[PDB]
PDB file of C-alpha atoms and ligand atoms in Angstrom:
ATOM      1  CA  UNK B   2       2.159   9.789 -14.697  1.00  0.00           C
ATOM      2  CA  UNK B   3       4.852   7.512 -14.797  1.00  0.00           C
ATOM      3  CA  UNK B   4       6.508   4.566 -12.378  1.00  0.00           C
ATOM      4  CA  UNK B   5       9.788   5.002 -12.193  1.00  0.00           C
ATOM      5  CA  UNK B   6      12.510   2.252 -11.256  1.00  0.00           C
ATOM      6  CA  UNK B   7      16.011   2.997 -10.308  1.00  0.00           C
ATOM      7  CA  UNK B   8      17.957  -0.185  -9.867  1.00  0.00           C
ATOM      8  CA  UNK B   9      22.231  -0.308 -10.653  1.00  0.00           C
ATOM      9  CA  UNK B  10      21.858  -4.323 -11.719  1.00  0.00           C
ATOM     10  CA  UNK B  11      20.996  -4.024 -15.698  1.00  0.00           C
ATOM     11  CA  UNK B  12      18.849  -7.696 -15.496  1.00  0.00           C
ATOM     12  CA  UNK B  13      16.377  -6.865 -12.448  1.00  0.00           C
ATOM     13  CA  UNK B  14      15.834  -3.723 -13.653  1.00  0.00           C
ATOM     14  CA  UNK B  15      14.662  -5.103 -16.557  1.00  0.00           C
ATOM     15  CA  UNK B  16      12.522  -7.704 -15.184  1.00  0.00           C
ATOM     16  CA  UNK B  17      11.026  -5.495 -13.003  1.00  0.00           C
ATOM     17  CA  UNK B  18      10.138  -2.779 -16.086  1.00  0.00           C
ATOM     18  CA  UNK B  19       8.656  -6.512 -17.528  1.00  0.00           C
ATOM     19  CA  UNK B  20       6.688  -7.139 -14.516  1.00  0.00           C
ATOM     20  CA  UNK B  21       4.792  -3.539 -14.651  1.00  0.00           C
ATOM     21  CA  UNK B  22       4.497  -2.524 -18.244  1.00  0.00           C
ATOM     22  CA  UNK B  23       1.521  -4.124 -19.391  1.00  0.00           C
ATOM     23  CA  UNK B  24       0.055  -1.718 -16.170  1.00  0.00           C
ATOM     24  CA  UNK B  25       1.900   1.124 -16.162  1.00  0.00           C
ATOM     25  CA  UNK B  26       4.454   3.948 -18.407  1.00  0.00           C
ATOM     26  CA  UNK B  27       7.610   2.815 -16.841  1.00  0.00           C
ATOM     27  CA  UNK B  28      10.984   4.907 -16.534  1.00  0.00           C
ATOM     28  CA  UNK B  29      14.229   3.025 -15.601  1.00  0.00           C
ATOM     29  CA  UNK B  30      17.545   4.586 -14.225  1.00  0.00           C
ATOM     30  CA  UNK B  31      20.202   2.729 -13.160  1.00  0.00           C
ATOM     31  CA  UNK B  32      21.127   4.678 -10.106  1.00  0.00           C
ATOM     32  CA  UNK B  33      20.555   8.267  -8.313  1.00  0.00           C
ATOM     33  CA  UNK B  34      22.264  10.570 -10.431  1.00  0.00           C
ATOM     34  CA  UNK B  35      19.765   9.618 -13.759  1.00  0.00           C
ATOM     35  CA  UNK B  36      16.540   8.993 -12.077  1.00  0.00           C
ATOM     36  CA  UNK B  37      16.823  12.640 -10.121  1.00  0.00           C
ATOM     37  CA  UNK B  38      16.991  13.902 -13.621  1.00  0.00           C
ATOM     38  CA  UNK B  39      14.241  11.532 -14.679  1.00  0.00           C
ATOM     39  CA  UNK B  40      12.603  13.710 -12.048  1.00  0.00           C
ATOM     40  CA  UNK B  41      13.503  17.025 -13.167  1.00  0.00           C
ATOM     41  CA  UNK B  42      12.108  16.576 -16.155  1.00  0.00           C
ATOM     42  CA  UNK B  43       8.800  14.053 -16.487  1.00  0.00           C
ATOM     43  CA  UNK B  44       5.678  13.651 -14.201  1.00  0.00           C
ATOM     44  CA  UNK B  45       6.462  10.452 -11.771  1.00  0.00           C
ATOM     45  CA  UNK B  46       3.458   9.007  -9.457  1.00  0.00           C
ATOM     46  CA  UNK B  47       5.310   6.036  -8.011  1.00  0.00           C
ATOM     47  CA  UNK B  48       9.325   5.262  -7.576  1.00  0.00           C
ATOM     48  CA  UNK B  49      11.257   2.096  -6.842  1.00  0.00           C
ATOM     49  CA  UNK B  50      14.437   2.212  -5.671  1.00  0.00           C
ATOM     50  CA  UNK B  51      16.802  -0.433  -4.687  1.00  0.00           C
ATOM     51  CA  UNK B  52      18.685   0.530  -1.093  1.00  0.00           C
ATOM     52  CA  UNK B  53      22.287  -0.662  -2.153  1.00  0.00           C
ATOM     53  CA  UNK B  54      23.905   0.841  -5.272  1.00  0.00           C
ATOM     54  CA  UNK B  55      27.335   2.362  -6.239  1.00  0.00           C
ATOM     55  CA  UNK B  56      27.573   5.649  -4.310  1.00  0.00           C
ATOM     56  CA  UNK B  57      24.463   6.712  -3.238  1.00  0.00           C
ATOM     57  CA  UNK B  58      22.285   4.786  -1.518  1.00  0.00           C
ATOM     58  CA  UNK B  59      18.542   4.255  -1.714  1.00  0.00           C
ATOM     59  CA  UNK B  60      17.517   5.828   1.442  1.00  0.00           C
ATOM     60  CA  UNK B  61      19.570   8.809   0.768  1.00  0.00           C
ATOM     61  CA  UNK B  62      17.576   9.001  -2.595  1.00  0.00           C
ATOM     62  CA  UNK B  63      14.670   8.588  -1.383  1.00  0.00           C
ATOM     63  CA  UNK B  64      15.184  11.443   1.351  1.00  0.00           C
ATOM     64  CA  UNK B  65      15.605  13.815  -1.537  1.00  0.00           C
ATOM     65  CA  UNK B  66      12.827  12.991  -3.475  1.00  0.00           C
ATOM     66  CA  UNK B  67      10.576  12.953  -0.240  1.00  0.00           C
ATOM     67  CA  UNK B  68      11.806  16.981   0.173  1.00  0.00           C
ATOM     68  CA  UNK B  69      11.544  17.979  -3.909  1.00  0.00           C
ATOM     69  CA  UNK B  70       8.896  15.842  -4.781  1.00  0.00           C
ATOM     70  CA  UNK B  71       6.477  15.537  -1.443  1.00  0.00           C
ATOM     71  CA  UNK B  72       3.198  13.539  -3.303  1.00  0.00           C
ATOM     72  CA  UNK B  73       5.201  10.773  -4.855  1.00  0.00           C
ATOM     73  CA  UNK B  74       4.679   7.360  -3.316  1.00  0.00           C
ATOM     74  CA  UNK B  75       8.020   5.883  -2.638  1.00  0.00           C
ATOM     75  CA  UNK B  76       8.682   2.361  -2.280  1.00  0.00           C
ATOM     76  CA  UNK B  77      12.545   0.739  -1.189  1.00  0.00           C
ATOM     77  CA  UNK B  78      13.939  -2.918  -2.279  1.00  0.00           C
ATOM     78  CA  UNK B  79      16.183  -3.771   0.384  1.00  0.00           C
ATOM     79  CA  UNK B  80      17.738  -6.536   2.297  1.00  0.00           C
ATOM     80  CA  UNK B  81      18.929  -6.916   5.859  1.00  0.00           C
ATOM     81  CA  UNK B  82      15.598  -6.621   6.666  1.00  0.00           C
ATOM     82  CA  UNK B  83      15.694  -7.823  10.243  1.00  0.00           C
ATOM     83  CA  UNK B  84      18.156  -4.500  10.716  1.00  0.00           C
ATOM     84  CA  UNK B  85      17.166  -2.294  13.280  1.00  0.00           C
ATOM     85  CA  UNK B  86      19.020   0.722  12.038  1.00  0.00           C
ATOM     86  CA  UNK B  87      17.871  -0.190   7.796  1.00  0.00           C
ATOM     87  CA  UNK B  88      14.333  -0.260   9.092  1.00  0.00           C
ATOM     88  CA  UNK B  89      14.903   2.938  11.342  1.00  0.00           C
ATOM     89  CA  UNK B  90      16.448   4.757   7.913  1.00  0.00           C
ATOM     90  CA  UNK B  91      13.569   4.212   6.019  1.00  0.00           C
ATOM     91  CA  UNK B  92      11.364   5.272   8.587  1.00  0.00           C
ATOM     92  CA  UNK B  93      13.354   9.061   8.613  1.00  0.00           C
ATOM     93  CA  UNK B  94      13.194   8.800   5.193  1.00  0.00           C
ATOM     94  CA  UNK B  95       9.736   9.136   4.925  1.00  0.00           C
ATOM     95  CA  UNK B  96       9.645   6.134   2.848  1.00  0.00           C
ATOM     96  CA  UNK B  97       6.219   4.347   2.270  1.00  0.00           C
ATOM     97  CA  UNK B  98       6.684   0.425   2.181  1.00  0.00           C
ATOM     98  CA  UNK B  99       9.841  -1.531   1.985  1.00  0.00           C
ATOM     99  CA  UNK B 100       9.931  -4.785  -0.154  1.00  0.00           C
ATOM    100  CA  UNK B 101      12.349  -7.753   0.790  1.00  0.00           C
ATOM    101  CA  UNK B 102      15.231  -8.531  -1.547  1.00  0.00           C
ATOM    102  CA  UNK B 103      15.132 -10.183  -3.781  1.00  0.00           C
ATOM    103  CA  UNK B 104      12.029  -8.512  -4.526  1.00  0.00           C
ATOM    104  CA  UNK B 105       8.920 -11.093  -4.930  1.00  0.00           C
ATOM    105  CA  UNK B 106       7.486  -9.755  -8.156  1.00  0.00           C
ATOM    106  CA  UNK B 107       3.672 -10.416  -7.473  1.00  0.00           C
ATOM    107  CA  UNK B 108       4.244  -8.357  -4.233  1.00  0.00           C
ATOM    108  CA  UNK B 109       5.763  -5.463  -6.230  1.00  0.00           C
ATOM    109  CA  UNK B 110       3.125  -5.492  -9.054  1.00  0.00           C
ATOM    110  CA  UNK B 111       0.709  -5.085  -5.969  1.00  0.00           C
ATOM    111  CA  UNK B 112       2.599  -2.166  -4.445  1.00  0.00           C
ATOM    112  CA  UNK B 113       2.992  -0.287  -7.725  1.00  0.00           C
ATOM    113  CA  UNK B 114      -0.692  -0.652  -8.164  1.00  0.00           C
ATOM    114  CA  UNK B 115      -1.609   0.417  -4.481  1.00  0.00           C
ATOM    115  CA  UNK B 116       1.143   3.000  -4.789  1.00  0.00           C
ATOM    116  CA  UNK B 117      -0.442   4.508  -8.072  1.00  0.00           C
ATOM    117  CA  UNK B 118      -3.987   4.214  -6.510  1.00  0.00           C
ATOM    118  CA  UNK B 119      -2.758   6.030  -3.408  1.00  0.00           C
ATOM    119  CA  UNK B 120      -1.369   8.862  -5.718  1.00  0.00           C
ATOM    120  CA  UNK B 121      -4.564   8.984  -8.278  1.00  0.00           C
ATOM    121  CA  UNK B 122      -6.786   9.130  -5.013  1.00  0.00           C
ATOM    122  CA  UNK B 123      -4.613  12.189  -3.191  1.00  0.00           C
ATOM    123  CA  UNK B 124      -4.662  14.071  -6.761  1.00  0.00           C
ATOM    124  CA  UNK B 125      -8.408  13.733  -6.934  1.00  0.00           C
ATOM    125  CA  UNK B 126      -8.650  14.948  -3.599  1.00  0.00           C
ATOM    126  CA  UNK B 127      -6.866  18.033  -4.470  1.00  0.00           C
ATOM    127  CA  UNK B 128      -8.919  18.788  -7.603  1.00  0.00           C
ATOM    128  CA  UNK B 129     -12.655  17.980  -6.316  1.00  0.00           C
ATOM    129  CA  UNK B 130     -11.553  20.425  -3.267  1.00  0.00           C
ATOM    130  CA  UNK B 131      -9.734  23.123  -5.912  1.00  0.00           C
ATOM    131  CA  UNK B 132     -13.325  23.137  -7.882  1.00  0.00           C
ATOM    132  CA  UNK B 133     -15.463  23.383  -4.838  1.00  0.00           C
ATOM    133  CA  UNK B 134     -13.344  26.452  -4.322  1.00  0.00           C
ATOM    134  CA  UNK B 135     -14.819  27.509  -7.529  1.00  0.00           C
ATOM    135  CA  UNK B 136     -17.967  26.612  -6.962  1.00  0.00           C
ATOM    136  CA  UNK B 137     -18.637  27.756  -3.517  1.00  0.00           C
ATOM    137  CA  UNK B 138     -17.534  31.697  -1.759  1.00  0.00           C
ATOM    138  CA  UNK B 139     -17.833  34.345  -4.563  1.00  0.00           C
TER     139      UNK B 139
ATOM    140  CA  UNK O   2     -13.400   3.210  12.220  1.00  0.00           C
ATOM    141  CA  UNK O   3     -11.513  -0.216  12.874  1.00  0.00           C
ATOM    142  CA  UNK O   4      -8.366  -2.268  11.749  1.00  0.00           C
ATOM    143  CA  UNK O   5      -9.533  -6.036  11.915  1.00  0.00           C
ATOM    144  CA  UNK O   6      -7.320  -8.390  12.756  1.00  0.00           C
ATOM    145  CA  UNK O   7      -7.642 -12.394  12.339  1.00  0.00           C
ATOM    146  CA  UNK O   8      -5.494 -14.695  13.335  1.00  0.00           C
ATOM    147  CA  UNK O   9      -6.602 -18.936  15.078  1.00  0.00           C
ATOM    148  CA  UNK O  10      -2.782 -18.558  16.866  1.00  0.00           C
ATOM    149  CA  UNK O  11      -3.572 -16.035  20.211  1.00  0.00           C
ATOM    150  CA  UNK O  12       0.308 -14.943  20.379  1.00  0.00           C
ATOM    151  CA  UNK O  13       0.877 -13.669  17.123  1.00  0.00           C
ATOM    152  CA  UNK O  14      -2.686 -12.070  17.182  1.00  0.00           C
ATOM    153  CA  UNK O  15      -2.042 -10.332  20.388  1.00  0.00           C
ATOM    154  CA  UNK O  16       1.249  -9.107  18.617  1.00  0.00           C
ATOM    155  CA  UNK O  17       0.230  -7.901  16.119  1.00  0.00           C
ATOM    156  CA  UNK O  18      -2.417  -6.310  18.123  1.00  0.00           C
ATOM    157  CA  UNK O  19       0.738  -4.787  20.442  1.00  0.00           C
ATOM    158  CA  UNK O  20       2.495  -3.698  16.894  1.00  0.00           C
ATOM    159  CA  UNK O  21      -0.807  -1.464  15.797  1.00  0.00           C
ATOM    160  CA  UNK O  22      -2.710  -0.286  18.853  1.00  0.00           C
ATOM    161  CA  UNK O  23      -0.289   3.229  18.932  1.00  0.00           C
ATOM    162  CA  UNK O  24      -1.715   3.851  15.517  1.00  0.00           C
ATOM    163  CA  UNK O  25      -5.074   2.373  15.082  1.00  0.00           C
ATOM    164  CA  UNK O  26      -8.434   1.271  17.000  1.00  0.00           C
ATOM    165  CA  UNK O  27      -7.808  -2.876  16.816  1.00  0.00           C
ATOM    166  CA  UNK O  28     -10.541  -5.154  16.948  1.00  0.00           C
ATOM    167  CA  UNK O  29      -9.334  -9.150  17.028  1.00  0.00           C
ATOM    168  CA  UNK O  30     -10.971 -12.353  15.708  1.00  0.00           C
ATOM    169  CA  UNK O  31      -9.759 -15.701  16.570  1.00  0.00           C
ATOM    170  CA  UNK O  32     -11.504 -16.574  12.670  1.00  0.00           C
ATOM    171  CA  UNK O  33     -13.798 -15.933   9.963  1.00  0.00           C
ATOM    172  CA  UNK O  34     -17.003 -16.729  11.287  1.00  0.00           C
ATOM    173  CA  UNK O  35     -15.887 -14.938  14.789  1.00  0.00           C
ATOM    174  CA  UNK O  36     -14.653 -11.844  12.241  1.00  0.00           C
ATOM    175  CA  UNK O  37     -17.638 -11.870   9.967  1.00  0.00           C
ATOM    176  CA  UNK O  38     -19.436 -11.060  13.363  1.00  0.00           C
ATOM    177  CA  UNK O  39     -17.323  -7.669  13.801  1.00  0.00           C
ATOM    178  CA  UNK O  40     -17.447  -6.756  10.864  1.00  0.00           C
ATOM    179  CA  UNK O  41     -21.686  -6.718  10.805  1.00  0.00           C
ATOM    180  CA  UNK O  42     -21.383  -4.619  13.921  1.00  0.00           C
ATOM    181  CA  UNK O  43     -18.462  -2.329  13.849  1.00  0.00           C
ATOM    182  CA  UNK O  44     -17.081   0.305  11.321  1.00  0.00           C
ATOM    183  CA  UNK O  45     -14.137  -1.529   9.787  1.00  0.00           C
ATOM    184  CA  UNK O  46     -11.226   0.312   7.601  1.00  0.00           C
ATOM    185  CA  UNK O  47      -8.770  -2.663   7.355  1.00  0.00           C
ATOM    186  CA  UNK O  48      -8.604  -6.176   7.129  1.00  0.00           C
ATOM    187  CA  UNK O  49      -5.258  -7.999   7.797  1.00  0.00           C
ATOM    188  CA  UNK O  50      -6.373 -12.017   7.868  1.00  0.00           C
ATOM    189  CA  UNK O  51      -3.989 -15.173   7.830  1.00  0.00           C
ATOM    190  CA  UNK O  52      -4.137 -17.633   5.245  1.00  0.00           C
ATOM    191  CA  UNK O  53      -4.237 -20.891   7.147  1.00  0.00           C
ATOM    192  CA  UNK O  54      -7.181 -21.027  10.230  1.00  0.00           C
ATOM    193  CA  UNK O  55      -8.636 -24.082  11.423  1.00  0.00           C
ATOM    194  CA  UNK O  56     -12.136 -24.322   8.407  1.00  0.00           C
ATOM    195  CA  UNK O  57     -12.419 -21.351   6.706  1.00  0.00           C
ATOM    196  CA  UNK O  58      -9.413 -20.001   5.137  1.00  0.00           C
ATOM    197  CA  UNK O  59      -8.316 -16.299   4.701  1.00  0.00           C
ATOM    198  CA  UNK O  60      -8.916 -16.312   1.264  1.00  0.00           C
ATOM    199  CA  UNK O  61     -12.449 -17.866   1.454  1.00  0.00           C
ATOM    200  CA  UNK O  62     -12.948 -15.261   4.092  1.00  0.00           C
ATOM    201  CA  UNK O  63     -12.026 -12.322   2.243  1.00  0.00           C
ATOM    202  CA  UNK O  64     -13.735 -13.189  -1.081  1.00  0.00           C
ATOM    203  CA  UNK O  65     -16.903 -12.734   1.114  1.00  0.00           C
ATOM    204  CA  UNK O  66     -15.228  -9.638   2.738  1.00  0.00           C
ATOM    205  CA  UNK O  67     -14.918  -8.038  -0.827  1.00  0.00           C
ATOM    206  CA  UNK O  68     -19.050  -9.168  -1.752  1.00  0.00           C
ATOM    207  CA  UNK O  69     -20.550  -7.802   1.510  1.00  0.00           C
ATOM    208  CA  UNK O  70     -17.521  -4.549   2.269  1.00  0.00           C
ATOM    209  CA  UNK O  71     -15.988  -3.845  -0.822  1.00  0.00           C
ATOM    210  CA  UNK O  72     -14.554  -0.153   0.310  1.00  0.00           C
ATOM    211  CA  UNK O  73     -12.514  -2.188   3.013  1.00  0.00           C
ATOM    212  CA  UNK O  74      -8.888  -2.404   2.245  1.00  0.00           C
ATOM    213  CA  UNK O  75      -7.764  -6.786   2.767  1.00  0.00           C
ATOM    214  CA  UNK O  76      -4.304  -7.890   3.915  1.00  0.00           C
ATOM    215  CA  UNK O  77      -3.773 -11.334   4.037  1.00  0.00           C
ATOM    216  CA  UNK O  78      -0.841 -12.939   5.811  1.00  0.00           C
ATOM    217  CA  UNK O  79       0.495 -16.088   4.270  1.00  0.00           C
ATOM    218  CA  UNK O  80       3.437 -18.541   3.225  1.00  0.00           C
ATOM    219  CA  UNK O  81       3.546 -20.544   0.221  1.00  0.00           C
ATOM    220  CA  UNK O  82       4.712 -17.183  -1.547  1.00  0.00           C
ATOM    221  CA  UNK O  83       6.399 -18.654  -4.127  1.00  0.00           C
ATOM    222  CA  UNK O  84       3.364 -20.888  -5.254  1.00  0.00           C
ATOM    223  CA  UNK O  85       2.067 -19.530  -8.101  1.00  0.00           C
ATOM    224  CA  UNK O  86      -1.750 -20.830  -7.344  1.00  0.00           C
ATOM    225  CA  UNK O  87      -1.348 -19.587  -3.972  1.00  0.00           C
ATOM    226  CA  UNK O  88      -0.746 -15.961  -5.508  1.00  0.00           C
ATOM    227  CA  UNK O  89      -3.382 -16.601  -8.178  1.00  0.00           C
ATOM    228  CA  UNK O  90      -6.010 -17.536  -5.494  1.00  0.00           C
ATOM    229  CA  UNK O  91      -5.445 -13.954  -3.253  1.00  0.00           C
ATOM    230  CA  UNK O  92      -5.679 -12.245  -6.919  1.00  0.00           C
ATOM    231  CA  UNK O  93      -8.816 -13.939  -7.763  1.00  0.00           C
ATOM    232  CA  UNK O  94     -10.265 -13.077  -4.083  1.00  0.00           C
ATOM    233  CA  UNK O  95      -9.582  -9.339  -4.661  1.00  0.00           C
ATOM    234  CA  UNK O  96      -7.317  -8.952  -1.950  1.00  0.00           C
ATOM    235  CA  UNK O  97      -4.749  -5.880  -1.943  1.00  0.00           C
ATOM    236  CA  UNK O  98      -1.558  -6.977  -0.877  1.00  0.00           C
ATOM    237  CA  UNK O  99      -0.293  -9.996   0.868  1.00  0.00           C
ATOM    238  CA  UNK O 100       2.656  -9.919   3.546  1.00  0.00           C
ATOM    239  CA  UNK O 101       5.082 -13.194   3.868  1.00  0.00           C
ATOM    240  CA  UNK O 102       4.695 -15.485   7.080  1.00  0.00           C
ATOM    241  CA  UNK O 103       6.171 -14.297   9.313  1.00  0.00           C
ATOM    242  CA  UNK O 104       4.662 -11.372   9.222  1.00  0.00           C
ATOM    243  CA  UNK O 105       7.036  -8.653   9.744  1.00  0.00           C
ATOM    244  CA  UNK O 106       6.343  -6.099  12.274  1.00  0.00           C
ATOM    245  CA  UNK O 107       7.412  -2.937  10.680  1.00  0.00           C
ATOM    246  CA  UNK O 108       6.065  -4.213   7.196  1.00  0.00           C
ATOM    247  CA  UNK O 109       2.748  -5.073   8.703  1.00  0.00           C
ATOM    248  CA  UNK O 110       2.734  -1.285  10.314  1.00  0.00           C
ATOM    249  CA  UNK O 111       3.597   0.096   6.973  1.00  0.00           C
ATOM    250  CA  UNK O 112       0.829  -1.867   5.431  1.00  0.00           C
ATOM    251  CA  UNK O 113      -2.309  -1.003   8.232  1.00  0.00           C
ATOM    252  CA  UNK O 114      -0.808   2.911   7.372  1.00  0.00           C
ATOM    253  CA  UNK O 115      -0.927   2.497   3.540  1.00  0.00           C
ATOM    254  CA  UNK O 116      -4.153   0.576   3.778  1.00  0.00           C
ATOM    255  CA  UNK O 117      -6.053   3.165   6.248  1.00  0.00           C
ATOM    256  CA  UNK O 118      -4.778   6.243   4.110  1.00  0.00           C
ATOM    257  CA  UNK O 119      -5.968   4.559   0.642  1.00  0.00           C
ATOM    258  CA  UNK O 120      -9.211   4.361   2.869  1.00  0.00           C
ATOM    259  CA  UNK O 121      -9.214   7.921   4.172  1.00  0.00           C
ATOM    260  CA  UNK O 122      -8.337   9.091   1.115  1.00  0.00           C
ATOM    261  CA  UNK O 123     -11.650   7.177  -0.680  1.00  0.00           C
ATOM    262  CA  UNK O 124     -13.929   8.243   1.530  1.00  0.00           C
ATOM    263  CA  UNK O 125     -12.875  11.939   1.347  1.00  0.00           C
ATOM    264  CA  UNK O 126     -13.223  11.263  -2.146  1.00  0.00           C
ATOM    265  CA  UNK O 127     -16.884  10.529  -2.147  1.00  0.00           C
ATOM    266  CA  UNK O 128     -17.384  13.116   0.654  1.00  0.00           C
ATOM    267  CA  UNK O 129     -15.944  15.420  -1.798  1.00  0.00           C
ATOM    268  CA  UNK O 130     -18.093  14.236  -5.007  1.00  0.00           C
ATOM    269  CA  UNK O 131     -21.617  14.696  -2.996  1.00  0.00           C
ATOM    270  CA  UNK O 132     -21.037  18.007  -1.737  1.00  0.00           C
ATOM    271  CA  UNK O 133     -20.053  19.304  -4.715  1.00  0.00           C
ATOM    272  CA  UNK O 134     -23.645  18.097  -5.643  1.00  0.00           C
ATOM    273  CA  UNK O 135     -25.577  19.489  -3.148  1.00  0.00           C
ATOM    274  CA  UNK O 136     -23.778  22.917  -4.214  1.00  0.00           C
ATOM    275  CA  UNK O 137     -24.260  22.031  -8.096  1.00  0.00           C
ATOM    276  CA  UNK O 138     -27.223  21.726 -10.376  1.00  0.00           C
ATOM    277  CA  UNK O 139     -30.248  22.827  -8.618  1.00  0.00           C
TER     278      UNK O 139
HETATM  279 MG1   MG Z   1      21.837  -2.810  -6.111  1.00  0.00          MG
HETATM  280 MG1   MG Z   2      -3.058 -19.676  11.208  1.00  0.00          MG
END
């Protein structure tokens, strides 16, 4: 499974895609619109999303791929940081982590990785118990 | 089991203590050798350690942390993000994921949560694995 980035400046989305391909398959979109129909249509594990973009935001995003795709592991770039009501958003959102713009890219290789982990360790979870189902009842 | 918190400065140890304590069981260490103790007594999920502690640094600390509980998920807290030895130091040590000094409450929240899930999640894991065992083979 993919990560997939969704950033509306051309030149961090590109470093970021930098940072994490020698780790990961890595998507890009450059806002909300084309990375929903990245979605639709390949097998994401991990998204990035930066919170401020031209129309819709990151946190509104983020809500709907919380409610169509549940097991992703969703991480925001945002600043205002020390914002009550931005931290309170991602909470609702059901957002994982948050990084700090501009995004430290050691810290974000580290969340993709612990992001992916997260997701390969929930998935295995699922099978081992699907096959004991198999195993065990008749 | 535990989240393990170590910090020499009493205030922002007892904060961070206030931040978790909701969410988690929190044991405190005023430094390594003091958190070395815990952690050959008491059941510990989590690990969030500064950097900078009169002697024995965080990342001396959990280097040892990795060789003697290496299913523990490490946090350190540190500045000097931007030195590239600094970052290639907490690689080396095996640590998961640093967070910027100061540590930011609702980041370091996010982090314990990620962190204890990732360890929930591994240990189900390996739950999972040997009782599929004792049900296959014979
Ligand atoms: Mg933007
Ligand atoms: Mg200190």
């Amino acid at each position: 499974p993919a990560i997939l980035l969704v950033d509306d400046e051309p030149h961090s989305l590109a470093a970021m895609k930098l940072a994490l391909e020698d780790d990961f398959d890595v998507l890009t979109a450059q806002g909300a619109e084309a990375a929903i129909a990245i979605l639709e249509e390949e097998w994401v594990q991990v998204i990035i999303c930066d919170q401020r973009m031209p129309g819709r935001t990151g946190v509104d995003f983020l809500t709907e791929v919380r409610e169509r795709w549940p097991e992703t592991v969703r991480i925001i770039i945002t600043g205002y940081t020390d914002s009550a009501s931005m931290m309170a958003a991602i909470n609702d959102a059901g957002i994982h982590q948050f990084l700090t713009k501009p995004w430290h890219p050691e810290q974000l290789l580290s969340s993709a990785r612990n992001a992916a982990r997260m997701f390969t360790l929930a998935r295995e979870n699922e099978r081992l118990s699907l096959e004991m189902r198999l195993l065990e009842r008749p």
